[PDB]
Amino acid sequence: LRRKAARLVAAKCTLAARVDSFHESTEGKVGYELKDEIERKFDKWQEPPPVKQVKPLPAPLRKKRGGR
RNA sequence: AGCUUUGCGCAGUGGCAGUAUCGUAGCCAAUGAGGUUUAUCCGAGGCGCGAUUAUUGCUAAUACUUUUCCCAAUAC
Incomplete structure (x- = not known):
């Protein structure tokens, strides 16, 4: 962080x-x-750093578009 | 009176790429973000978090039978 600090200083x-x-x-x-x-x-x-949550695995399992 | 420049909207016609698009009553930022080169020089967003088919909506593909009519003398 020393160069970031030097710019501010x-x-x-x-x-x-x-x-x-x-x-x-x-x-x-x-x-x-x-x-x-x-x-x-x-x-x-x-x-x-802030407390950050763990993301669980979504689910092991709907229509999809089609075009260019 | 045409010609033309810049920025902003509304459209239309195309081309290109889906490892990227968007959000930010979160933080920092021209009183300076970021700096690998050009540093007594350059000059804007950056970080964290969040959504997701790495933008989001539609449209379509994945089936036939209810009914309602009946037999009879020119006779003790």
């Missing part, structure tokens, strides 16, 4: 650098929000 770093180039969000709210988003998307990737 690069995008959010571009956003933070554009934020900082005008010296706005001096205290650091935007960076904290972007880091929180990055961490949440990282946890989503590593979140354990």
